[PDB]
Enzyme design. Structure first.
Site, PDB file in Angstrom:
ATOM      1  N   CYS A   1      -9.391  10.173  69.233  1.00  0.00           N
ATOM      2  CA  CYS A   1      -8.537  10.829  70.245  1.00  0.00           C
ATOM      3  C   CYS A   1      -8.978  12.181  70.722  1.00  0.00           C
ATOM      4  O   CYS A   1      -8.525  12.620  71.768  1.00  0.00           O
ATOM      5  CB  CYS A   1      -7.114  11.059  69.751  1.00  0.00           C
ATOM      6  SG  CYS A   1      -6.441   9.486  69.344  1.00  0.00           S
TER       7      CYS A   1
ATOM      8  N   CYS B   1      -4.890  15.936  67.797  1.00  0.00           N
ATOM      9  CA  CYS B   1      -5.327  15.355  66.535  1.00  0.00           C
ATOM     10  C   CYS B   1      -6.089  14.066  66.778  1.00  0.00           C
ATOM     11  O   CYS B   1      -6.024  13.472  67.863  1.00  0.00           O
ATOM     12  CB  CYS B   1      -4.133  15.083  65.609  1.00  0.00           C
ATOM     13  SG  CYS B   1      -3.021  13.748  66.137  1.00  0.00           S
TER      14      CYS B   1
HETATM   15  C1  COA Z   1       0.156  -4.122  70.287  1.00  0.00           C
HETATM   16  C2  COA Z   1       0.818  -3.053  71.127  1.00  0.00           C
HETATM   17  C3  COA Z   1       0.304  -3.257  72.555  1.00  0.00           C
HETATM   18  C4  COA Z   1       2.313  -3.267  71.029  1.00  0.00           C
HETATM   19  O1  COA Z   1       2.581  -4.572  71.529  1.00  0.00           O
HETATM   20  P1  COA Z   1       3.580  -4.698  72.771  1.00  0.00           P
HETATM   21  O2  COA Z   1       4.016  -6.134  72.968  1.00  0.00           O
HETATM   22  O3  COA Z   1       2.924  -4.148  74.020  1.00  0.00           O
HETATM   23  O4  COA Z   1       4.832  -3.796  72.327  1.00  0.00           O
HETATM   24  P2  COA Z   1       6.014  -3.545  73.364  1.00  0.00           P
HETATM   25  O5  COA Z   1       5.624  -2.441  74.324  1.00  0.00           O
HETATM   26  O6  COA Z   1       6.229  -4.834  74.120  1.00  0.00           O
HETATM   27  O7  COA Z   1       7.307  -3.107  72.504  1.00  0.00           O
HETATM   28  C5  COA Z   1       8.000  -3.980  71.616  1.00  0.00           C
HETATM   29  C6  COA Z   1       9.441  -3.992  72.089  1.00  0.00           C
HETATM   30  O8  COA Z   1       9.870  -2.630  72.175  1.00  0.00           O
HETATM   31  C7  COA Z   1      10.340  -2.333  73.496  1.00  0.00           C
HETATM   32  N1  COA Z   1       9.837  -1.032  74.015  1.00  0.00           N
HETATM   33  C8  COA Z   1       8.563  -0.574  74.052  1.00  0.00           C
HETATM   34  N2  COA Z   1       8.510   0.660  74.621  1.00  0.00           N
HETATM   35  C9  COA Z   1       9.768   1.005  74.963  1.00  0.00           C
HETATM   36  C10 COA Z   1      10.434   2.162  75.605  1.00  0.00           C
HETATM   37  N3  COA Z   1       9.735   3.244  76.004  1.00  0.00           N
HETATM   38  N4  COA Z   1      11.773   2.107  75.782  1.00  0.00           N
HETATM   39  C11 COA Z   1      12.490   1.042  75.378  1.00  0.00           C
HETATM   40  N5  COA Z   1      11.951  -0.037  74.792  1.00  0.00           N
HETATM   41  C12 COA Z   1      10.624  -0.116  74.563  1.00  0.00           C
HETATM   42  C13 COA Z   1       9.863  -3.454  74.405  1.00  0.00           C
HETATM   43  O9  COA Z   1      10.873  -3.844  75.340  1.00  0.00           O
HETATM   44  C14 COA Z   1       9.522  -4.608  73.488  1.00  0.00           C
HETATM   45  O10 COA Z   1      10.468  -5.660  73.717  1.00  0.00           O
HETATM   46  P3  COA Z   1      11.533  -6.260  72.677  1.00  0.00           P
HETATM   47  O11 COA Z   1      12.279  -5.111  72.040  1.00  0.00           O
HETATM   48  O12 COA Z   1      12.502  -7.128  73.445  1.00  0.00           O
HETATM   49  O13 COA Z   1      10.819  -7.068  71.622  1.00  0.00           O
HETATM   50  C15 COA Z   1       0.448  -1.702  70.490  1.00  0.00           C
HETATM   51  O14 COA Z   1      -0.982  -1.650  70.366  1.00  0.00           O
HETATM   52  C16 COA Z   1       0.958  -0.498  71.256  1.00  0.00           C
HETATM   53  O15 COA Z   1       1.352  -0.591  72.408  1.00  0.00           O
HETATM   54  N6  COA Z   1       0.973   0.699  70.665  1.00  0.00           N
HETATM   55  C17 COA Z   1       0.555   0.971  69.306  1.00  0.00           C
HETATM   56  C18 COA Z   1       1.057   2.343  68.880  1.00  0.00           C
HETATM   57  C19 COA Z   1      -0.132   3.252  68.723  1.00  0.00           C
HETATM   58  O16 COA Z   1      -0.646   3.433  67.622  1.00  0.00           O
HETATM   59  N7  COA Z   1      -0.593   3.791  69.842  1.00  0.00           N
HETATM   60  C20 COA Z   1      -1.796   4.603  69.824  1.00  0.00           C
HETATM   61  C21 COA Z   1      -1.550   6.092  69.758  1.00  0.00           C
HETATM   62  S1  COA Z   1      -2.650   6.838  68.539  1.00  0.00           S
END
Ligand code: COA
Ligand code: COA
Ligand code: COA
Ligand code: COA
Lengths: 382, 382, 382, 382
Positions: C87, C368
């Site tokens: 990062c 970080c």
């Molecule tokens: C695999 C990855 C893509 C997650 O998979 P994803 O399917 O895209 O996850 P989602 O964004 O769909 O979120 C899961 C659920 O949370 C909800 N959600 C996600 N972001 C949200 C927000 N800002 N507000 C409200 N709900 C949210 C989504 O609606 C989703 O649907 P569900 O509750 O009906 O199951 C994952 O790699 C990621 O996005 N982030 C990882 C975190 C991380 O370490 N990031 C790097 C920074 S170092």
């Protein structure tokens, strides 16, 4: 509408990723189809249907039976079908050919099996790959060696039969080592010389697996399927994965009479049985009981037996259940020593049976398959 | 040992990667097997064999016919086989079932086809990947849609037949649009309500493909297979890739008599033909000529025809060669509008034929397949 | 040999597999490099080095910094290097550029970051695939989001910091929702209009992630990394995966004087810190303590802060440890709302800081990275 | 703030998919980092930064420099970065380390390169695979050996330089065979015994590639990159793909004085050049002209040269352009015989140079890279 065997031939059976790797199941199927036609003394133009057993069909193209048939100079008008009954596939092919003749639809067919386990691929699923990736699936596992109802390896299933008969590691290993001995003896004495057709690649002329036994290693092996301490089946007393093909030309009594032919055997009867998937190892004796009953025969009527050796326990269970003389069973060795190209083994054991039988002797070939079924055929050597 | 149809049912046919994606060919096969047994009025315990057509078997497990049979509560003792004759697969399944009965081996069988083209995978070859990588092979292409002898798409092959009959883009497109019209009309009037069984996924109750026609786009499309300026076949006048299943329960005359049953149709005869792979499109009329000859019938004897619409030219060639009234052919639409789940289509057109025929009418269903073959069946509605 | 920022620009940040999918990290890097050169008022011929942060370099070709440089009309004689500090990558790029100038080696450089997480591939291992297959490895997981020393996700690691500060789900969620509020407010008021350059694809002109908040869903989400009941980090209060790029042109005091230039900011100092990998979330405050100490400043001297929001806890921990006024931190929102294209975020927060600062104000940007390190830079707006 | 080399070590270089296959680039980097620290006579706690050149970073995890540093017992507080300048990567690493010291930021750093080309994977693209499949991309090709601007192999590019100098197949082959002779002679006489550290796997103690020459085959080979009849570069006169690592500890004059250390060499100067990508082979002489000019030296001042042998033409062009005595160039053989682990070769040739130089002698190491750049360093042996 009696059913005769005019010819019965097989390739040598090669080890996994060995001498036949560069040849496809289609290539091997063409070898045995062409040679079976040659030894039938009928022209390829007389073959009315081509029926091919094959399990791991992925990547091989449309309907390999048609590819094989056309490349073997069988007429475009002839009908071609590929069938999958796992290990029983090419025994089913032979039964289908016999039925086609019995019912008067066909006069002359070629029934065979071919398997190139060396060329079975891996699968990537359709549709986008999720975050985190996905497992590449092994065709050999998923479509060949795993029971799909119990979702476990056929070798784990077979451990149930081991326990049911109170068989021991000692018996399974002794059985395996004896299959290798019989195979080695057969090759030393030329006993496979009537049935084996060499495969140009520079040429494969002998089965490969039986040479690979390391005797002193057999009791040292750990059970491969059941690891809770009660396991008995190992890499050495289970059959291996292999490449090979086998074929027979079948013809009706009318063809034989009109052609002044000298068929080598007659198909008298067949039977099919089914049990629970986990119990697949005991289906062959059930099929044979039906076969003998409907034929008015008993076990003593039968000169020689072929029981396909999916595992050593397959042979032991069969012999024990039917109270056979072990010296009349798989007399030239079985699949634990010779190899087990899945789609080919049904026809392969019929070929070996036909050529081990002496004139006027009765033989039975029987084979189990994943899913809980078995097929058996009764033949008379002419 | 006459052969009767007790029941004939099908799923709606879904588009590629659509509503049925989460269901496997095994799942769909279970749906139609269970419902065919229900409508046969026989218990599942009476079913002696399960015969299943399927082309793209990769990744589906051992012998899907056995998986389907067991999950449909058919006895473990019943025999199960999966067969591949490309597009003809489940017509061959029905013919095998009829033969089993004809020859007196079986009394009651279920014959079906199932295909989930949505779940056909990609292949990674066995053995280490060379420097520079390797192509991931599409099962749909390699094992489904490409002719393996000519090594070109079936749609390119079909262009030869287009030229041989002097057919035009205009005729192919008009034929396609009319297949869609007939399918739409059939669904509007409820004409498929005797044969379609809904599939819970929330439920699929209607064929999907026929709704996807964009009429004004049809003449705008470029030829999909032949691009030298003489091409005629397009995405719109070719069949699509699809998911679906279809099944019939067959029973002998003895079963019918003993059970006081009311079968819905009788299988009178069948025929099979073969030609050069490139000419596969004209094999169906050849099979029908044989069928009618051996049955002492002529074309005018036949009330309704089903010719599987691999392409619009398949229908046009059939109608022209046999000099049929087009208004008696595929009266509820064909695969160009309804979809073409390869392994299922043979049984699917028999199901549609059976339920379109009125009592005492004769019908013929015919289907070609990659590799140059075709199958046809003659049925009488009771 | 003072170090000035002549220009500081960024793309809008797009969601995963969204509007920028068809553009590579090279494409995005060219967009911001060309626009940074334009706004520096120097010709591309004057750029002596191109330094590019990028984490997921698989499949992108040789040394993307050189691809970007050449396609941006920077001379072939100019030096190009791609660097990976997870990062922190493009903050390190900026520090390298500053050092090159400080030491008198260079006069003018472009430092940037670019990441297309949409185009990160899956990996098949070299060498033959064993029996049973192999897992397809996700580049995003293995090379991006998993700590390689602890062999667990960075989000699981960050839970340790949550516990160490006694932070709560309630605080993490409130922090996240406020990051979204600030981002939304900034876009409504046009606060990003000095720094964002539109990307032709028909054109992306606004960050995508901040619009995706579903407020009522935030407390309903289950912890994503720690599932033993004590978890707090969720998809909503963690940053997302994203596509984007950001770039600055740096020049020496001599260049500025000779060119009569009006630089927009001055780089005063930088610092780097490292801790245990699991504790990576608290490294930024450590870097800042060093930064302020060596600069003779204290926290109150600083008008605005950018702390990259890998997680909500990253912001909370930083603010708490340094006893900052939260209203001076990430005033236009942070990565939880704006997105986190790994290789780009270091430069991206410097760009946002530069353009939020008013003349004569001091700002600190800190970030970080997985593995336990952090980088911080002190800047003065001119 | 003078820059001294305290230690300079390398692994033996292994062939592709050979003895070091089971070791990752991280594993090899740890071997040379630990041994370089040991021979520097400073504790690992004194190392302030770890700078690692690596090209094929796919699948290796986050920032391999940090993995290597931590596993080498370097403090968590020390800074770690991985950099990619294709073949120049670890020469750039050494230059970065020297700069950090020159500018007074650091006192002690470790600069290295590591490459495991054996473990470079294949890529499956993100997003769903289209009908017909997709090519599995080879990391070695796409990210290592193909120029990404010309979209052709570096060996095809190098043919341009062959033509520009009117070099012949005969000269390229004679050069290659002589590189092998010098390498063989060096190993026979123990000339690499000061620099090579053995790698436990049971142990690799000698370079592998130089033993693989088949002399009589060299003139029989067909050109590998240009096949229009004018080609000259072959597998034998091009470098190979390989596994290996190399490392140096650098320290300031202040450290040396305070520690009473006996550094083995001094870094006097460095230079970097760039040209058109296709002309990358002639960049090294351009860098050296700059190096010598700024240092007030001429070619005759220099006792020994290392020019990395990407191809035989790389050496020939360098020698011809600078009018060098060939007997002072790559005196222990070069990469055509020793192998070319991309990310390691920059540091590897500095290690070989340092240990071939006698006290008070001046040496130059120079290396080109895909994309058209080259780096050179001037050192004095103490
Ligand atoms: C695999 C990855 C893509 C997650 O998979 P994803 O399917 O895209 O996850 P989602 O964004 O769909 O979120 C899961 C659920 O949370 C909800 N959600 C996600 N972001 C949200 C927000 N800002 N507000 C409200 N709900 C949210 C989504 O609606 C989703 O649907 P569900 O509750 O009906 O199951 C994952 O790699 C990621 O996005 N982030 C990882 C975190 C991380 O370490 N990031 C790097 C920074 S170092
Ligand atoms: C995956 C599969 C290929 C096994 O993997 P494998 O590496 O080839 O297994 P091996 O043949 O190497 O055997 C394992 C060990 O047993 C030993 N072994 C195998 N066959 C032996 C024999 N006949 N005599 C002595 N030792 C033997 C091998 O030396 C090997 O070496 P090790 O003991 O030093 O570890 C497996 O699919 C297989 O071969 N058979 C599965 C059994 C089965 O279900 N067959 C299908 C019939 S339905
Ligand atoms: C690869 C395959 C899926 C085609 O790819 P595809 O993307 O799904 O093709 P599409 O359905 O999108 O058709 C291409 C175009 O024709 C149009 N089209 C397709 N069917 C149409 C119809 N019935 N009416 C009007 N337009 C149609 C589509 O709108 C599409 O969009 P475009 O014109 O804007 O480019 C192919 O395998 C297939 O569907 N059929 C192969 C034909 C075949 O041999 N079938 C097997 C029978 S043996
Ligand atoms: C793909 C790659 C591995 C070559 O494939 P390969 O199979 O390993 O090539 P080989 O080493 O087997 O050489 C081809 C033939 O030349 C022969 N050969 C190779 N090196 C030889 C030598 N030093 N002496 C004599 N013969 C040699 C081999 O015997 C081989 O056998 P053949 O002539 O019977 O066909 C390629 O990536 C490579 O090794 N180098 C690419 C060149 C390059 O750009 N290197 C990077 C430096 S920037």
């Amino acid at each position: 509408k009696d059913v005769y065997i005019l010819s019965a031939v097989r390739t040598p059976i090669a080890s996994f990723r060995s001498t036949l790797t560069s040849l496809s199941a289609v290539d091997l199927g063409i070898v045995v189809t062409k040679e079976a036609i040659k030894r039938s003394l009928l022209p390829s133009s007389a073959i009315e249907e081509t029926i091919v057993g094959n399990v791991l069909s992925a990547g091989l193209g449309q309907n390999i039976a048609r590819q094989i048939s056309i490349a073997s100079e069988i007429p475009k008008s002839s009908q071609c079908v590929t069938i999958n009954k796992v290990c029983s596939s090419s025994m089913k092919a032979i039964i289908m050919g016999a039925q086609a003749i019995q019912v008067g639809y066909r006069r002359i067919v070629v029934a065979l099996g071919s398997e190139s386990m060396s060329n079975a691929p891996f699968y990537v699923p359709r549709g986008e790959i999720p975050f985190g990736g996905v497992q590449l699936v092994d065709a050999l596992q998923r479509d060949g060696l795993m029971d799909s109802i119990e979702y476990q390896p056929m070798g784990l299933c077979a451990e149930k039969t081991v326990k049911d008969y109170a068989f021991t590691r000692e018996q399974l290993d002794a059985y395996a080592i004896e299959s290798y001995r019989k195979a080695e003896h057969a090759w030393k004495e030329g006993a496979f010389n009537k049935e084996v057709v060499p495969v140009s690649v520079v040429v494969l002329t002998e089965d490969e697996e039986y040479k690979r036994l390391i005797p002193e290693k057999v009791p040292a092996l750990h059970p491969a399927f059941l690891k809770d301490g009660s396991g008995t089946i190992t890499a050495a007393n289970a059959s291996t994965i292999n490449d090979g093909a086998a074929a027979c030309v079948l013809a009706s009594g009318e063809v034989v009479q009109e052609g002044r032919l000298k068929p080598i055997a007659k198909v008298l009867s067949y039977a099919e049985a089914g049990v629970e998937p986990i119990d697949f190892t005991v289906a062959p004796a059930l099929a044979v009981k039906q076969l003998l009953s409907q034929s008015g025969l008993d076990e003593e009527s039968i000169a020689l037996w072929e029981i396909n050796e999916a595992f050593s326990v397959t042979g032991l269970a069969f012999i024990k259940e039917l109270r056979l003389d072990p010296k009349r069973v798989n007399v030239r060795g079985g699949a634990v020593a010779l190899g087990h190209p899945l789609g080919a083994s049904g026809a392969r054991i019929v070929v070996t049976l036909v050529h081990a039988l002496k004139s006027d002797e009765l033989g039975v070939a029987a084979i189990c398959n994943g899913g809980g079924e078995a097929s058996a055929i009764l033949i008379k050597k002419l």
